[PDB]
Symmetry: C2
Subunit: 302 residues, 2 copies
């Protein structure tokens, strides 16, 4: 593939994009700063401006940058940290349409995106900002950046964001859960893997007594889901999953207890959030199912 | 006038509007909740729903209510406090187009509004929310509510908001300042009053050594203005004033020192913010003037 080609365009492109920013002085974000999109010409020779390269000519589209500065800021992501782990350390591909990549240090993921979505996102931002500034504990994905790359005619949109499941805490059981059932078992291929990413039925089968939760924790979660749903609902959004990482242990995640009885650090985050019908009540439905499902079956009190 | 008539429609209308709310349980505010507007029919007989009255038939339009609940919440305004001081204590008129009214307890003001404006406002809200959640120390007006009343054919839009200058701290000198000069002297009529509301030139005349400020305070203000301007700018907004209340003293305001040398508690807030051209650069201009003017002439460091 022209993949390594892209991997570069990213690290070349962002480093510029962001350093570019740390010139311009800080300022609050405005309803404008969302719609904006900046481009940068990256020739294989390279101006005294866009230099370097020998990799394959492109332009680097940076999106709503002042907004994403704000978001990083609020998610506590120092630019040098961001630039480093992302740009000065080789990017590593992944099996899963939509191609993922990962930071050498397992902190950051990179989905690609249907232009359909990328545009939706832009529109979401204000809505995002609001939820973010209100449900401080939201489960929604932490969107650190949005960028497009132009490879000849071709165009690649990508989003950068928090890996929910770092190598650090090693995950034993791993589930992608929706509250639905059609094809909601992990493919033969998938099950032939490490701590492979399961699914509703596999959970339901392999874990029918549930994930037990100390009342108070069960609430924080419950309410904070019910909040995230109500957002997503409102944005006519569907197919989202709760990604869950259980870790039996023989500190930056959730405390649980077992069907047997072992203590547990669990890790979650709602995902795949950009496909938006944007029927009349259908998302409103998918939210309630997702809700009842996680907050009744997948996690339970006492 | 049919004024006392209106005074009622308000207190009758809000009390319903808000109690109406304290049923529905709390929830984060969504980009939707801004656009919404609820109405309530208030007959002079009155349903078992909208009852009471003998005052003159009307409807009570309540605006973006979940947003304004949020705002009150964030400005720390407990509904019982709000309802009481506003609805269970006679409203008091005022001289100043645009009719003001005041809470018996001097906490709240009520401007009326050109439909032109009221609509602008709605649009501002998201923008408002952002600034509010970012410049915690903004000088912008604290908008507690927006309501319209329908008196026969007639329609009255009103906004409720923080009185910047309560009876509590008695204000000695009082200025309305813009950074302009045309008609920027206080009318003969006006000067024949208590601590009458002056203006640029009167300030410039009666106070040419300025309002002195302990470095650190001068900054908090300076930066926080420069922020508010940049918002307002962005909303293509003009004719705003800085309302200033100086109090010589022989604690909820700003510390200053004098041309002579007396200690001072000063009180400010940007106002008259809804008239929006919404020329190319003109607001951007009016902001910089307003800026330089307050942060150079009206307040100065050391
Ligand atoms: N933030 C994350 N942290 C950890 N793993 C993730 C994350 N995002 C995606 N993944 C992995 O990718 C899988 C699902 O991909 P997803 O994000 O749903 O996008 P997609 O390619 O559109 N899949 P779908 O559209 O549901 O078929 C998850 O089950 C995870 O195993
Ligand atoms: N929040 C407030 N606190 C104290 N006084 C206020 C407040 N708002 C308005 N006033 C008084 O009303 C005066 C100006 O009215 P303003 O709010 O500018 O609306 P307006 O009627 O549109 N005037 P303008 O449009 O500038 O001619 C101020 O100078 C104050 O004396
Ligand atoms: O997908 Se695209 O933007 O048409 O190349
Ligand atoms: O593959 Se599916 O039907 O979205 O779970
Ligand atoms: O001012 Se209005 O709304 O036309 O009565
Ligand atoms: O009356 Se004026 O010209 O707006 O200060
Ligand atoms: Mn998907
Ligand atoms: Mn005005």
């Amino acid at each position: 593939t022209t993949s390594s080609a892209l991997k570069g365009a990213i690290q070349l492109g962002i480093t510029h994009s962001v350093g570019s920013l740390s010139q311009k002085p800080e300022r609050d974000v405005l309803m404008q700063d969302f719609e904006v999109v900046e481009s940068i010409f990256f020739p294989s020779q390279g101006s005294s401006s866009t230099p370097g390269h020998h990799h394959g000519d492109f332009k680097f589209k940076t999106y709503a940058p002042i907004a994403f500065r704000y978001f990083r800021e609020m998610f506590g992501i120092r630019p040098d940290d961001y630039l480093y782990s992302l740009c000065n350390e080789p990017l590593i591909e992944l099996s899963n349409g939509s191609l993922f990549y990962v930071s050498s240090d397992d902190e950051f993921i990179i989905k690609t995106v249907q232009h359909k979505e990328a545009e939706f996102l832009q529109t979401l931002l204000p809505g995002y900002f609001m939820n973010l500034n209100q449900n401080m504990r939201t489960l929604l994905p932490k969107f650190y950046g949005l960028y497009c790359v132009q490879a000849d005619g071709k165009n690649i949109r990508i989003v950068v964001m928090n890996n929910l499941l770092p190598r650090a805490v090693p995950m034993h059981l791993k589930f992608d859960l929706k509250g639905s059932t059609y094809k909601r078992r992990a493919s033969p291929k998938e099950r032939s893997k490490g701590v492979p990413t399961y699914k509703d039925l596999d959970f339901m089968q392999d874990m029918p007594e549930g994930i037990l939760l100390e009342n108070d924790h069960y609430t924080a979660l419950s309410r904070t889901m019910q909040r995230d749903c109500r957002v997503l609902q409102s944005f006519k959004i569907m197919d989202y999953s709760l990604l869950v990482g259980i870790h039996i242990l023989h500190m930056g995640g959730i405390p649980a207890f077992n069907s047997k009885g072992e203590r547990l650090l669990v890790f979650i985050g709602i995902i795949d959030i950009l496909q938006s019908y944007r029927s009349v009540h259908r998302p409103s439905f998918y939210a309630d199912r997702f809700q009842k499902f996680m907050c009744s079956t997948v996690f339970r009190k006492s």
